[PDB]
Amino acid sequence: KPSYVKFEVPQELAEKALEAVEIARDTGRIRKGTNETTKAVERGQAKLVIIAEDVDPEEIVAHLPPLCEEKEIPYVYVPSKKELGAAAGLEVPAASVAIIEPGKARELVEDIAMKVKELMK
Amino acid sequence: NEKARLLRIRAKLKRKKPRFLRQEWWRYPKFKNDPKWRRPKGIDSKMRLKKKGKPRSPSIGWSSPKAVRGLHPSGYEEVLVHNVKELEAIDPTRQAARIAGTVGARKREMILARAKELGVKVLN
Amino acid sequence: SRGRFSYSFQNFDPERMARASGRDLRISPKHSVELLREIRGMMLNDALRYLDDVIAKKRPVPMKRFNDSQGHKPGKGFGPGRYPVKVAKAVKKILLNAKNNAEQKGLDVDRLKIIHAAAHRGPVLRGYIPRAFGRATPFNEQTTHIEIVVEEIR
Amino acid sequence: MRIINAEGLILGRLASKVAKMLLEGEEVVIVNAEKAIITGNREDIFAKYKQRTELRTRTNPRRGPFYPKRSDEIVRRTVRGMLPWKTDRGRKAFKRLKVYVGVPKEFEGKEFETISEAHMSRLATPKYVTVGEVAKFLGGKF
Amino acid sequence: AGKRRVTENIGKGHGMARVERIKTSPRFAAFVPFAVGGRRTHPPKVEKIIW
RNA sequence: CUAGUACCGUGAGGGAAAGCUGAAAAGCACCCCGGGAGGGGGGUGAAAAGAGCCUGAAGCCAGGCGGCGAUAGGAGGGUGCGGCCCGAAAGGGUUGACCCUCCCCGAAGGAAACACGGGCGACCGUGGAGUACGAGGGGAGGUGACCGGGGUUGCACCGUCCGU
RNA sequence: GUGAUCGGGUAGGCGGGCGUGCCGAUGGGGCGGAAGCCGGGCCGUGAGGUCCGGUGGACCCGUCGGUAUUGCGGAUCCUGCC
RNA sequence: CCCGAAAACAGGCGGCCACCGAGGGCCCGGGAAGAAGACCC
């Protein structure tokens, strides 16, 4: 239960997030890693975003919510790291993913944005 | 950092280091299928005279620094583990666990659980 | 089947392929090697016609690895040449076996191609021939194994 | 390619410079090769080149030192001697060379070069012979 | 043990080492400690002191 | 283990090799081809372990894959730089590989242009200047996936095997 | 801490370590797959150790102390196979 | 006089095809040629 967490998130939320980043690894643009995620959100190019639970220690994912709040774009909390690693298709565990140009998953991007804005209520 | 300086020294040294093999290991299958070092001892041998154009021989000068001698690339020192009683009695800041190869799955389960709790690293 | 010997072919598909073997044959593995290099990569009926020509001594086989004291032959690409007959009869029999096996599997016969033809050395059967000054030297028979895979085409 | 006019030039110095060129990666054409000079005395030089022509392998002459009788080949052979011939580097450098008697039409109407370091002007002695003389003695065409 | 066979030597000049061999075919070597079936060079004894 | 056996010598005498299916034979019913030994399908079995039977290594042979391959010279290797190929795990790595640029310190060492004068001259002296640089040690950033390792081979240099 | 006044070596002499089989003790593993075999990763100046994958189908290792038919490229070596 | 386009500047000319098919080999009857191959009609 690190600091960088704000709220509890159900299952289908983050699982749909995972399947979204995979359906987008299909064709569109995906940046993998804290540095490129933060540069994306700075340049605005970021549109949807995922973050992992067990990122330890949290001095590298603590200061992202203070980016994504002002950005106000959907960030989704998935609990595992190796799952994100396989979603992006790498043998390294990931902490953070920034997804851009979702083709084949515009539907689910809209959907999860709806549900996480419901959350944000 | 001194430890990192030493680790880079070891890196360069063990990259440039040759593979010390016998006189003519390339020439007889009996020596290709068990490549080991054996000191040359003959009177006319050239590897024993240490001539230009021939391979080299081991010496105490190629050794690695004493601080990092024996360490894992990760910077940890290894500890072979066959059970939980061995798993505990380990400092997770300087030591790491290698699980032995004869350990079965029923017991590897327990070992790995206890390790991820206590915070120990496991290289397998 | 029997289960005494296996094949060198990997990735064998039972729904497009058929096999045949000849084991413990009393012929030359050298001439077998040479002749299979030729029939390999061709269609089964073309190969049968080839074998008929060879048996009739109307078409020579080129020798490329086993050559000593071998004279050249009529027309382009020769070179050392020979006519083996026992080897050809044996190979003919194996090919007939494989044609049958395709048939009874369901494959169409005029659309098959040879994709594997290998010859292996079998066990030796030892004898002796008497020589001069009180000796006796080996006079032995070298056997051969042959394996064939045919694949139907689309 | 660079084009060099052997006319008033000294053979060995010309060849030394040209061979360094070749190794440093250029293409060289030499024209008017019959007009380079060789320094010494006539008897000495002719004896040398004759003793070279009549060298050969006693068992089979289809091997053998094939030392030439033509002027362009004399020049080409000197240059060769100045390179590593037993090496890929040298074989390529040597293939980058071409030597002609006269000036073919193909090269006519072009501006030639001359190597400063090699030239008859340096000399103090009236003793010199021409490669064409050597060739005539040996029995070569042009 | 190993000391039960009867041998004969080949001698020099037969492109063959000077090793003891039996007289009947197959004419295998015998009795020497580098042969297959021969006495062992330094084997264990009962005259040894353990106490 | 059907061994002082087979076998050798006129004879007195000499003298071998050779262990192991499976818990249970459940030791392959039946079909197609073949003169046949046999091959192919199907079946038993936890597993073909198929009697030519536990495990089943090397040398040797065939085929498939990868690399080289018909102008070329050394005992079949060493040092360095490259090209093609493999690369899951056990090695590192998205908490960021390789490469890139920026700064600070900086051992032993250490320029040039250029300005004045000396020498017939190659060049030297004073200043420029202990400057620019310099093995390595630290730090700040951008880029975003390979690196190390292995197989073979090209180039340049070096290299007349082993025991006595 | 000192070493400008240590750092080549045949015959030879001295010191420390790696590995193989059996015993007395101690501590462990194994049909959720032992030994052995193949190909690879890491540590080690090195002798060598250990892990991954595959094959295999019942036994094996560590530390302390003792013991030994205890380490091979050669003998115109022996046996078997090619 | 004999050999001689593998002369690594690995040639020159004329003509025929290619961008189904010009040419060639096997095969048949023979020798002026011949250890097999090649050569000639």
mmCIF file of C-alpha atoms in Angstrom, chain C residues 13-151:
data_model
loop_
_atom_site.group_PDB
_atom_site.id
_atom_site.type_symbol
_atom_site.label_atom_id
_atom_site.label_comp_id
_atom_site.label_asym_id
_atom_site.label_seq_id
_atom_site.Cartn_x
_atom_site.Cartn_y
_atom_site.Cartn_z
ATOM 1 C CA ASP C 13 3.257 -35.154 -41.252
ATOM 2 C CA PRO C 14 1.155 -38.356 -41.461
ATOM 3 C CA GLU C 15 -1.565 -36.651 -43.549
ATOM 4 C CA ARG C 16 0.632 -35.599 -46.477
ATOM 5 C CA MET C 17 3.507 -38.087 -46.332
ATOM 6 C CA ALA C 18 4.326 -41.746 -46.760
ATOM 7 C CA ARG C 19 7.329 -43.803 -45.731
ATOM 8 C CA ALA C 20 9.157 -46.924 -46.797
ATOM 9 C CA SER C 21 12.268 -48.773 -45.693
ATOM 10 C CA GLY C 22 14.617 -51.518 -46.734
ATOM 11 C CA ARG C 23 16.761 -53.063 -44.032
ATOM 12 C CA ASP C 24 19.760 -55.403 -44.092
ATOM 13 C CA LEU C 25 20.340 -55.303 -47.849
ATOM 14 C CA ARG C 26 23.339 -56.922 -49.515
ATOM 15 C CA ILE C 27 24.479 -54.170 -51.862
ATOM 16 C CA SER C 28 27.040 -51.385 -51.909
ATOM 17 C CA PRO C 29 26.316 -48.342 -49.707
ATOM 18 C CA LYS C 30 28.603 -46.323 -51.985
ATOM 19 C CA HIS C 31 26.622 -46.981 -55.153
ATOM 20 C CA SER C 32 23.428 -46.500 -53.161
ATOM 21 C CA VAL C 33 24.614 -43.045 -52.073
ATOM 22 C CA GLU C 34 25.444 -42.139 -55.652
ATOM 23 C CA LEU C 35 22.126 -43.288 -57.133
ATOM 24 C CA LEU C 36 19.971 -41.710 -54.437
ATOM 25 C CA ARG C 37 21.633 -38.340 -54.949
ATOM 26 C CA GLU C 38 20.077 -38.570 -58.407
ATOM 27 C CA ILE C 39 16.576 -39.876 -57.775
ATOM 28 C CA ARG C 40 16.170 -37.462 -54.857
ATOM 29 C CA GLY C 41 14.044 -34.403 -55.536
ATOM 30 C CA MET C 42 12.049 -35.912 -58.394
ATOM 31 C CA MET C 43 8.671 -37.502 -58.936
ATOM 32 C CA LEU C 44 8.160 -41.171 -58.315
ATOM 33 C CA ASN C 45 7.228 -42.156 -61.871
ATOM 34 C CA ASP C 46 10.103 -40.253 -63.448
ATOM 35 C CA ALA C 47 12.335 -42.038 -60.953
ATOM 36 C CA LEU C 48 10.946 -45.432 -61.939
ATOM 37 C CA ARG C 49 11.634 -44.713 -65.617
ATOM 38 C CA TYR C 50 15.154 -43.611 -64.666
ATOM 39 C CA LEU C 51 15.678 -46.913 -62.865
ATOM 40 C CA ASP C 52 14.448 -48.893 -65.863
ATOM 41 C CA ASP C 53 16.912 -47.079 -68.120
ATOM 42 C CA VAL C 54 19.752 -47.787 -65.705
ATOM 43 C CA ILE C 55 18.886 -51.470 -65.423
ATOM 44 C CA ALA C 56 18.828 -51.703 -69.217
ATOM 45 C CA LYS C 57 22.194 -49.881 -69.461
ATOM 46 C CA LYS C 58 20.790 -47.058 -71.571
ATOM 47 C CA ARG C 59 21.512 -44.281 -69.072
ATOM 48 C CA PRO C 60 24.640 -43.996 -66.912
ATOM 49 C CA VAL C 61 24.842 -42.731 -63.355
ATOM 50 C CA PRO C 62 27.531 -40.141 -62.560
ATOM 51 C CA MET C 63 30.121 -40.927 -59.926
ATOM 52 C CA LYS C 64 31.236 -37.886 -57.964
ATOM 53 C CA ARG C 65 32.616 -39.120 -54.636
ATOM 54 C CA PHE C 66 33.727 -42.702 -55.412
ATOM 55 C CA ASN C 67 35.737 -42.586 -58.601
ATOM 56 C CA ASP C 68 39.024 -44.497 -58.631
ATOM 57 C CA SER C 69 40.069 -46.018 -61.968
ATOM 58 C CA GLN C 70 36.724 -45.097 -63.501
ATOM 59 C CA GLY C 71 36.404 -44.310 -67.154
ATOM 60 C CA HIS C 72 34.349 -41.590 -68.723
ATOM 61 C CA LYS C 73 31.086 -42.038 -70.704
ATOM 62 C CA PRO C 74 29.152 -40.676 -74.276
ATOM 63 C CA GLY C 75 27.866 -37.062 -74.142
ATOM 64 C CA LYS C 76 27.785 -34.030 -71.806
ATOM 65 C CA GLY C 77 28.526 -34.124 -68.032
ATOM 66 C CA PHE C 78 30.740 -37.262 -68.052
ATOM 67 C CA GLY C 79 33.032 -37.487 -66.278
ATOM 68 C CA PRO C 80 33.128 -40.829 -64.372
ATOM 69 C CA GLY C 81 29.982 -42.954 -64.973
ATOM 70 C CA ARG C 82 28.656 -46.419 -63.998
ATOM 71 C CA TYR C 83 25.605 -48.742 -64.278
ATOM 72 C CA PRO C 84 24.488 -50.425 -61.051
ATOM 73 C CA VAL C 85 21.703 -52.965 -61.355
ATOM 74 C CA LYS C 86 21.208 -54.674 -57.983
ATOM 75 C CA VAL C 87 20.972 -51.273 -56.298
ATOM 76 C CA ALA C 88 18.393 -50.134 -58.826
ATOM 77 C CA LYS C 89 16.229 -53.223 -58.372
ATOM 78 C CA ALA C 90 16.287 -52.749 -54.601
ATOM 79 C CA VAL C 91 15.371 -49.051 -54.840
ATOM 80 C CA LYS C 92 12.585 -49.954 -57.280
ATOM 81 C CA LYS C 93 11.086 -52.313 -54.714
ATOM 82 C CA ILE C 94 11.200 -49.696 -51.958
ATOM 83 C CA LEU C 95 9.511 -47.146 -54.220
ATOM 84 C CA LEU C 96 6.729 -49.622 -54.975
ATOM 85 C CA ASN C 97 6.213 -50.151 -51.237
ATOM 86 C CA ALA C 98 5.898 -46.395 -50.719
ATOM 87 C CA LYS C 99 3.485 -45.996 -53.624
ATOM 88 C CA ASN C 100 1.265 -48.629 -52.030
ATOM 89 C CA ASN C 101 1.455 -46.965 -48.645
ATOM 90 C CA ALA C 102 0.416 -43.610 -50.037
ATOM 91 C CA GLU C 103 -2.459 -45.284 -51.894
ATOM 92 C CA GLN C 104 -3.837 -47.117 -48.869
ATOM 93 C CA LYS C 105 -3.496 -43.900 -46.876
ATOM 94 C CA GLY C 106 -5.565 -41.952 -49.388
ATOM 95 C CA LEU C 107 -2.977 -39.940 -51.294
ATOM 96 C CA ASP C 108 -3.114 -39.568 -55.052
ATOM 97 C CA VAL C 109 -0.291 -41.346 -56.815
ATOM 98 C CA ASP C 110 0.462 -39.147 -59.819
ATOM 99 C CA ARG C 111 1.079 -36.096 -57.611
ATOM 100 C CA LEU C 112 3.768 -37.515 -55.272
ATOM 101 C CA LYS C 113 7.342 -36.276 -54.963
ATOM 102 C CA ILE C 114 10.406 -37.819 -53.320
ATOM 103 C CA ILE C 115 11.546 -35.511 -50.513
ATOM 104 C CA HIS C 116 13.911 -37.830 -48.638
ATOM 105 C CA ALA C 117 16.271 -40.536 -49.872
ATOM 106 C CA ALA C 118 18.981 -41.714 -47.484
ATOM 107 C CA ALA C 119 21.292 -44.714 -47.335
ATOM 108 C CA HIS C 120 22.847 -46.007 -44.129
ATOM 109 C CA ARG C 121 25.512 -48.552 -43.317
ATOM 110 C CA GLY C 122 24.313 -51.710 -41.649
ATOM 111 C CA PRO C 123 26.093 -54.421 -39.721
ATOM 112 C CA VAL C 124 29.018 -56.342 -41.152
ATOM 113 C CA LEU C 125 29.013 -60.109 -41.685
ATOM 114 C CA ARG C 126 32.503 -61.462 -41.199
ATOM 115 C CA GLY C 127 34.382 -64.067 -43.193
ATOM 116 C CA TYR C 128 37.916 -64.925 -44.211
ATOM 117 C CA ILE C 129 39.821 -65.647 -47.417
ATOM 118 C CA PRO C 130 43.092 -67.631 -47.352
ATOM 119 C CA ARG C 131 46.279 -66.004 -48.593
ATOM 120 C CA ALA C 132 49.946 -66.895 -48.999
ATOM 121 C CA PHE C 133 52.562 -67.661 -46.344
ATOM 122 C CA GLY C 134 50.100 -68.854 -43.714
ATOM 123 C CA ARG C 135 47.723 -65.895 -43.387
ATOM 124 C CA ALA C 136 43.972 -65.386 -43.537
ATOM 125 C CA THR C 137 42.477 -61.957 -44.160
ATOM 126 C CA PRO C 138 38.980 -60.472 -43.874
ATOM 127 C CA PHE C 139 36.535 -61.195 -46.706
ATOM 128 C CA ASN C 140 33.420 -59.432 -45.479
ATOM 129 C CA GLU C 141 29.982 -58.310 -46.616
ATOM 130 C CA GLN C 142 28.783 -54.751 -46.059
ATOM 131 C CA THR C 143 25.028 -54.272 -45.884
ATOM 132 C CA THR C 144 22.883 -51.207 -46.338
ATOM 133 C CA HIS C 145 19.736 -49.537 -45.038
ATOM 134 C CA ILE C 146 17.515 -47.386 -47.242
ATOM 135 C CA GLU C 147 14.766 -44.996 -46.163
ATOM 136 C CA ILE C 148 12.360 -43.097 -48.407
ATOM 137 C CA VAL C 149 9.742 -40.390 -47.807
ATOM 138 C CA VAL C 150 7.253 -39.224 -50.438
ATOM 139 C CA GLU C 151 4.991 -36.193 -50.159
#
